[PDB]
Design a protein around this ligand. Structure first.
Ligand SMILES: CCCCCCCC/C=C\CCCCCCCC(=O)OC[C@H](CO)OC(=O)CCCCCCCCCCCCCCC
Ligand SMILES: CCCCCCCC/C=C\CCCCCCCC(=O)OC[C@H](CO)OC(=O)CCCCCCCCCCCCCCC
Ligand SMILES: CCCCCCCC/C=C\CCCCCCCC(=O)OC[C@H](CO)OC(=O)CCCCCCCCCCCCCCC
Ligand SMILES: CC(C)CCC[C@@H](C)[C@H]1CC[C@H]2[C@@H]3CC=C4C[C@@H](OC(=O)CCC(=O)O)CC[C@]4(C)[C@H]3CC[C@]12C
Ligand SMILES: CC(C)CCC[C@@H](C)[C@H]1CC[C@H]2[C@@H]3CC=C4C[C@@H](OC(=O)CCC(=O)O)CC[C@]4(C)[C@H]3CC[C@]12C
Ligand SMILES: [Ca+2]
Ligand SMILES: [Ca+2]
Lengths: 430, 686, 686, 47
């Protein structure tokens, strides 16, 4: 089962071809593989099966790692299963991240360059494995294709930042192993940087899970639909940026003559710098009163008033005029999207499924680290193609014949016939 | 350069003689065709069974032009008639009679299509009747999940064929005409089939649309038969027919079970139900709104009186009054409202109870509330008993009833556990966090929320709030789906922020006013613990989280900046992106929902009305203190069904004739008709 | 009981014989009709000119059935032929020729309709041509608002007729086919007529829709003729034709004047313009995305030099380079961008100045900004002069340019004034509220905002941003209307609130930190004054107004409650209602605008491209230091137009024949064709 | 005036129907019958 054409279809973005029932049927058969009854089992039984497979994902993986021929080793082959096993692996990883702080790093609050707790070490393995997977994938498939789909693109940064985090940790453990109070640490102390980067990666890791939505028939369409509209936001972004800076400049010009929006008592310092002016206006966007109207100067009434007008106008333009527009755009956008959601979702899910169809990737990340006839084929293809072509022609013939409505031309043609017959007879009979 | 164009799908070409023969058939020159046939016999220069490049042989070309004369001529001579019956059925000609009467690869029909199936797929009552007259059979479609039969478990041989074959049988079984002609209870079968098709749509994901289309077809058929009723006698005979007491609106009930919404909403059906609902108030429709209002008010006020009379002597005139459904509804609504008023009094100095008596004695108000609570629970028990867990569970509101009742029970239990083990009266501030009394009060309040929200159910009754309620409920589903997406967003950022600030957590003691958390005058440690993080991000959606919650005490610029960026991104994604998308999504949904609100609302209202039509009913406070006949009934039903089916067939034809453009093929036939007439006349006159 | 039904407005009835006569005409029985006529001539028993219940006579029945044989028969017997031509023209048949050749009370046509007018309304080129061949004239409609002519003062009598008659005339003059056959320059005629019709749509409030429709008909006609161009030589001959230099895209300019957006956006037209725009950049668009960026950036950086070269040696390689439209755009944009960058440098206050010096000497950056300012001014001056005030006034951005520039002027004036006077230095605090320096700074800031927001215009040059910019503009009009309503509400609540709290105003000194207003740490005296009340209500829209501001210190409970209630009602009306309604309205428009987004954007883009296509152009900083020919041109234009018209007429006909369904009239015609045919044959065979 | 307005109205409606109503299947059937009936008649006379 090379599934060459199927793959070329996805390459050439043949969404309709991929969403045609005949193709969907073929796919499902392959996806569930021998686990066909799965389709028939009642929701309850299916739910149970899925959970069971996932829980023992390491065990099943091990079986394949040891006796791929074993019935269990075979279980991982079923594309559907691999998905479950690989999905569980990721979830366990996310768990490790969660238990990293909630239930660890309890006495290293003030230890600069802290040691590498086992959690860190384990996580390391997973990160490595996930990286390797990307490489292998990028290798086999290619580059642009790999970069095209998001789960991969996020997988790059995520893995990157994760890599940096652990690196800096090693450097810190060496250079700075002090045990001073956290407060006394320099703002850019390696440990501080690592923790910040690690945290951000954690956000990215979870966001990645969005891909799984495609599989669900309920939330999958919506997930895809949202992504579609996520493009039209870009347009709005450009417009807003211009507005943000336009007003930023003016505010700074009128005000440049503990500190910032982020303090209990918001200071006019919000406008003193430029970046601050940007932040300050940024929070106004949300229209939930994140920044007070204290644009007043310490004292300059006029100067303070004009400032109020400037900020007020910004709010009216952005919070009201621009936003409502955004909604309008989204509304129109979704309408059209709603029309083809099925096709789009199907194509997406298929692209996802095929990834598992391959035999190249079988082992979840943590384990993954552990490493002529042609004439006949063509002949048959031609036979089948001949049939499909004939069927197509006949079918189209019938469809048109039974749908295409008569036209004035046809009427006129008929009337001509009646006339010609009329005349002919009239002449033949004087 | 140039791109060469060569024919690769090589195909043999028809001899000039052959080609000519085919052309004559298309023009209807019986003579020329006749001559050609005769000559070919003697001379053998043209295969009478030749075919156009488009696969149109002579018999087929004749059938499409519907020239039965030429058809007979061709058939008389030995012309292959393979699959011709099928073409004559697809085209829906009644020249099928001729082919059936004669009886002596690259097919446009799959190997599974049998004449009866194709006729059914076409829905030609006549053509179908012909075939059915001769013994005909459509294979049984093994039930869903019939994998047990190795027969179906051998789908491995050819799945696509199996699936397609299955759809073809159902596409046939679900034809309104075949169900009219072959089924004993056309209405019941359509109900059942509709359901099965629905279920299959789910199991067979591919072909989902197809199965769903078929189900709607079955649902429409049943409604249409109902619409063909011309007297109330017929409507009763139909709606009160029990397959196997009677006179219980049995089929109306089965229709509600199978979600046959349209059937239930049919005008006539609604009218009958209304008469039963408003019994005791004839002309209630004509009653002035004010008058109505007055009547309702009085009855509700006297609800206790009516409730008792029944208990004492159901036979009593008064006893009789509460039995009427509309009354039951009004009485039962008043009881609930009274209950809710009791709940309101509980929060007042109506009884002015002390607030330091741990394990206090139940107040009078609480005492009075108890009976009702008991009635509500008892009602639920009966509901479960009288309806089975399935029905009870199915109902969404039974879920809320359960929750409300369960809380109103834990409240009682905790109250008791507190009367005992707590005879003192220590200061409220001294009471521990989980003092039973405190927990009890909490549960009671939560339930008071649920109880007052149950009133939304009553809206289904009004003609204005009802449809609105239904539409909103549908939209709620959409919102639920969005929340799932959002949730992942929340979780992501929650973990990130917690992972960044968990180091900088501080003891509540350190905090001002010994308060630690987002719900403190000075919001502090909002991201220190995960749970706080989730809550904090949740509140930030409502702009109740201050921005000074992102600054670490030690003032580490880098960390604070990363945090602020993370918080800001969350706010953009949630408030500016997801929120706005939800709005657009919802806009679309409402447009669609609005269209079917009526059928959705009426179905809902009918279920409500039906609930009261039943006999077992008393308000919650006072809630806890022949073969012969069958045959005749069935005969009457069959009589009505015969009439309805007849009326339906005729109406559908009329609609098809009065609402269908003249396709091109139709024109072609007319042209061929003139052509044939011409040739004939020319010959006779020449 | 029973309602008797009678014919109230009775009309004469047809005798049996007369009924038969008309019946024959509907069946096409020439023989019977002929006989009836002949007998009537003898026994005078039938009024040849009788009328059906629908008022149709024999000739009218024949015309509708299109039986010219019978028509001739009737005409030969001299039947009243009144208005028959009009009926024939409406049926669009060659019976018109017969009636015209046959030359010498109730009507479906108003008394004003004339044969040519109706033909025009029908848009049948052939029938129109036939009528025009014979002298025919359509009255010239008086100019919009021509009261001088007492003839227009006829409106006093039967204005209805006056209005209808006028619309009928225009409905005819606006027929694509008439314009094609009669007008010398079909394109220009359409352009002009489409505009006049638009103006009329406004003046004639009623019948607006009709005039607007007719206008669109004209606009589309022009685009359609252009679409029938096949070679560039033609397209150039058409778009560069000057009615009367040439090679100046004169017609395209006229189109832009008459807002013929579809014409200006036609694909082929847009293609030509592009070639002119990207002169020197073969396949600039084709150039890899990055490549484009590279080239643009490089050219931009070199803008001063290129500009300098043109200044030095207009006739040099470099001097010529700037003349290219795309280069001008690149340069003129880079210049503006640098201007904005200079303004940014002020923000960072790279050149810091003491805050105490009154009227300081203009800072270094200022001087640098001064030239651009002057250049922009002179630019606008040139535009105004060159284009005339009307055109300049028309441009909306011109308003922004005017405002931006004016602010820059004042800023300078004040800067200057503050220098001569206030020459000394004092602590800023001492400075009076309206110190010149202070006011100047504010004006400068506002101007900077305006200047940067002028970049929005550049979005029209982008394929992605442009359409959005255009849509936004369209919506802005509606937003303005909504704002008026909001303002009224604001004023109302402002007046009310101020009316209640003005009794409780307090002194700034009294107020903590001597701060009075809604912009102080603890908001105070929010509703004390109308000016403040207005501000407070505005900021409330954004949630920046705290609720404690609704309480009076003396603590008069009632007043405070009314005050809070008024504030609350305002919030609901403004945020919950009006704001939300704006969303709905904007969604409605965005939907519509989206339908014509591209044409709008492209029309806009062309206008921009055209501006640069001209020759008077240098960046703002360096901005301030034979009849024979016409005959030939016209001949060519006429030839091209002839061909375009020819191919257009044909296309329209072909479309109709292949893209139109068969209406009932068609059935009736066929039925008649067979009927008359039958009768004839039967007679011959009999 | 009413007499005139009704006459004008009725006529307009008929025109609208004729020009804005498609040919239905029943129409096809009638046309077919007309041809068929004519055929039989002619064939009988000529036969
Ligand atoms: C895309 C970008 C282009 C859009 C262009 C223009 C959009 C219109 C801009 C109008 C902004 C004027 C408001 C500035 C301002 O008032 O400053 C307050 C400042 C704050 O001190 O107050 C004042 O200057 C004077 C007090 C009068 C305030 C009332 C003005 C109401 C004007 C309309 C408000 C609309 C709110 C609608 C909410 C449903
Ligand atoms: C579904 C989930 C997937 C969606 C994925 C991505 C959506 C785009 C995410 C972009 C978020 C960037 C904003 C973060 C941030 O700026 O932190 C503020 C923080 C607060 O300190 O400020 C800064 O970090 C730097 C100051 C620059 C602020 C201006 C940035 C503007 C960017 C666009 C804003 C759009 C607002 C539109 C409102 C009409
Ligand atoms: C266009 C302009 C015409 C629109 C006309 C009318 C629109 C309806 C106006 C109703 C405003 C009544 C609210 C005034 C008020 O309650 O003051 C609060 C004041 C504040 O003290 O509180 C009260 O007076 C009594 C407390 C009851 C508050 C609950 C009232 C709820 C009424 C509906 C609210 C709708 C919110 C929907 C949000 C999804
Ligand atoms: C708006 C605030 C004051 C809350 C009021 C709470 C209740 C007093 C309201 C809320 C919903 C109302 C119910 C909404 C639906 C109906 C249907 C209504 O019946 C009809 O509208 C049509 C006649 C019919 O029921 O057959 C009878 C009143 C009732 C129970 C209403 C009774 C009064 C209710 C319980
Ligand atoms: C987003 C923030 C950083 C504000 C940036 C302000 C400017 C640097 C941006 C805002 C709008 C941009 C302009 C938007 C429109 C265009 C059209 C663009 O041309 C095209 O896109 C297609 C080729 C063509 O113009 O023919 C040339 C760049 C330009 C002037 C852009 C130049 C860079 C601008 C001025
Ligand atoms: Ca219940
Ligand atoms: Ca200008």
């Amino acid at each position: 089962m090379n599934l060459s054409r199927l793959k070329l279809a996805i390459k050439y973005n043949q969404k309709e071809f991929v969403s045609q029932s005949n193709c969907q049927q073929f796919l499902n058969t392959v996806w569930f593989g021998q686990m066909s009854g799965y389709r028939r089992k009642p929701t309850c039984k299916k739910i149970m099966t899925v959970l069971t497979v996932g829980i023992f994902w390491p065990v099943l993986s091990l079986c394949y790692l040891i006796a791929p021929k074993s019935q269990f080793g075979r279980i991982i082959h079923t594309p559907f299963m691999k998905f479950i096993i690989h999905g569980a692996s990721y979830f366990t990883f996310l768990l490790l991240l969660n238990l990293y702080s909630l239930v660890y790093n309890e006495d290293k609050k003030n230890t600069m360059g802290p040691a590498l707790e086992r959690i860190d070490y384990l996580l390391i393995l997973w990160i490595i494995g996930m990286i390797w997977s990307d490489i292998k994938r990028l290798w086999y498939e290619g580059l642009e294709d790999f970069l095209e789909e998001s789960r991969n693109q996020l997988s790059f940064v995520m893995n990157s930042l994760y890599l940096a985090t652990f690196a800096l940790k090693v450097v810190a453990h060496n250079k700075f192993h002090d045990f001073a109070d956290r407060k006394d640490w320099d703002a850019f102390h390696p440990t501080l940087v690592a923790e910040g980067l690690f945290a951000f990666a954690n956000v990215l890791s979870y966001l990645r899970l969005f891909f799984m939505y495609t599989t669900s028939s309920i939330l999958g369409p919506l997930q895809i639909s949202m992504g579609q509209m996520l493009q039209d936001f870009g347009k709005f972004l450009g417009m807003f940026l211009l507005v943000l800076f336009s007003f930023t400049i003016g505010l700074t010009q009128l005000y440049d003559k503990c500190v910032g929006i982020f303090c209990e008592q918001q200071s006019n310092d919000t406008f003193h710098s430029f970046i601050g002016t940007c932040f300050a206006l940024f929070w106004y966007i949300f229209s939930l009163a994140h920044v007070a109207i204290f644009v007043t100067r310490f004292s300059e009434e006029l100067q303070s008033f004009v400032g109020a007008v400037i900020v007020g106008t910004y709010n009216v333009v952005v919070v009201i005029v621009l936003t409502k527009l955004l909604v309008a755009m989204l509304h129109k956008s979704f309408q059209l999207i709603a029309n083809h959601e099925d096709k789009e979702w199907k194509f997406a899910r298929a692209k996802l499924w095929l990834s598992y169809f391959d035999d190249k990737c079988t082992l979840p990340p943590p384990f993954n680290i552990i490493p002529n006839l042609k004439q006949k084929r063509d002949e048959n293809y031609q036979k089948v193609m001949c049939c499909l072509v004939h069927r197509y022609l006949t079918s189209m013939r019938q469809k048109m014949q039974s749908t295409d409505q008569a036209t004035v031309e046809n009427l006129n043609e008929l009337r001509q016939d009646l006339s010609k017959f009329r005349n002919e007879i009239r002449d033949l009979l004087g | 350069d140039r791109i060469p164009l060569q024919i690769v799908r090589a195909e043999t070409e028809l001899s000039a003689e052959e080609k000519a023969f085919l052309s004559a058939v298309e023009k209807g020159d019986y003579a020329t065709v006749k001559q050609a046939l005769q000559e070919a016999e003697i001379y053998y220069n043209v295969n009478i069974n030749c075919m156009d490049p488009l696969g149109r042989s002579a018999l087929l070309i004749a059938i499409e032009n519907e020239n039965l004369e030429i058809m007979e001529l061709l058939l008389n001579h030995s012309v292959y008639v393979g699959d011709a019956l099928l073409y004559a059925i697809r085209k829906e000609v009644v020249g099928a009679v001729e082919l059936l009467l004669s009886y002596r690869q690259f097919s446009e029909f799959t190997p599974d299509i049998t004449p009866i199936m194709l006729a059914a797929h076409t829905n030609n009552y006549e053509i179908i009747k012909l075939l059915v007259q001769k013994r005909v059979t459509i294979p049984r479609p093994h039930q869903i999940r019939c994998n047990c039969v190795e027969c179906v478990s051998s789908s491995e041989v050819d799945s696509l064929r199996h699936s397609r074959s299955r759809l073809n049988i159902y596409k046939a079984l679900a034809s309104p005409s075949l169900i009219a002609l072959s089924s004993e209870d056309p209405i019941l079968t359509a109900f059942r089939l509709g359901w099965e098709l629905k279920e299959l749509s789910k199991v067979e994901n591919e072909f989902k649309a197809e199965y769903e289309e078929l189900s709607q077809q079955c649902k429409l058929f049943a409604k249409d038969l109902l619409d063909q009723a011309r007297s109330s006698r017929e409507l009763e005979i139909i709606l009160n027919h029990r397959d196997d007491k009677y006179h219980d609106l049995a089929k109306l009930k089965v229709a509600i079970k199978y979600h046959q919404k349209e059937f239930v909403a049919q005008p006539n059906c609604q009218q009958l139900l209304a008469t039963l609902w408003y019994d005791g108030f004839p002309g209630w429709r004509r009653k002035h709104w004010v008058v109505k209002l007055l009547t309702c008010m009085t009855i509700g006020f006297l609800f206790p009186m009516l409730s008792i009379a029944y208990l004492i002597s159901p036979r009593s005139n008064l006893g009789l009054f509460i039995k009427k459904p509309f009354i039951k509804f009004i009485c039962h609504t008043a009881s609930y409202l009274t209950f809710l008023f009791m709940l309101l009094l509980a929060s007042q100095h109506i009884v002015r109870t002390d607030l330091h008596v741990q394990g206090p004695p139940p107040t009078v108000v609480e005492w009075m509330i108890l009976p009702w609570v008991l009635g509500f629970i008892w009602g639920e028990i009966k509901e479960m008993w009288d309806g089975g867990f399935t029905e009870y569970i199915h109902d969404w509101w039974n879920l809320m009833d359960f929750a409300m009742n369960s809380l109103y029970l834990a409240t009682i239990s905790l109250k008791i556990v507190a009367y005992v083990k707590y005879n003192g009266s220590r200061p409220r501030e001294e009471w521990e966090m989980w003092h039973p009394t405190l927990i009890a009060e909490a549960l009671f309040a939560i339930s008071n929320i649920l109880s007052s929200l149950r009133l939304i159910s009553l809206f289904t009754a009004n003609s204005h709030l009802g449809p609105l309620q239904i539409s909103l409920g549908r939209m709620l589903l959409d919102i639920l789906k969005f929340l799932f997406i959002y949730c992942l967003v929340l979780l992501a950022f929650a973990n990130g922020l917690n992972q960044l600030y968990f180091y900088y957590e501080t003891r509540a003691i350190d905090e001002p006013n010994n308060c630690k958390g987002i719900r403190c005058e000075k919001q502090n440690n909002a991201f220190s613990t995960l749970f706080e993080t989730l809550q904090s991000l949740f509140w930030s959606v409502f702009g109740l989280l201050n921005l000074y919650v992102t600054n670490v005490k030690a003032r580490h610029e880098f960390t604070e900046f990363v945090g602020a960026t993370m918080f800001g991104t969350y706010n953009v994604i949630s408030l500016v992106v997801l929120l706005n998308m939800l709005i657009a999504m919802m806009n679309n949904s409402y447009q669609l929902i609005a269209d079917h609100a009526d059928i959705e609302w009426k179905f809902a209202r009918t279920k409500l009305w039906m609930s009261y039509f039943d006999e077992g009913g008393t308000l919650p406070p006072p809630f806890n203190i022949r073969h012969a006949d069958s045959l005749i009934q069935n005969q009457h039903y069959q009589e009505v069904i015969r009439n309805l089916v007849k009326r339906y067939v005729a109406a559908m034809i009329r609609n098809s004739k009065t609402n269908e453009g003249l396709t091109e093929e139709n024109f072609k036939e007319l042209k061929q008709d003139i052509s044939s007439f011409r040739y004939e006349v020319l010959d006779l006159l020449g």
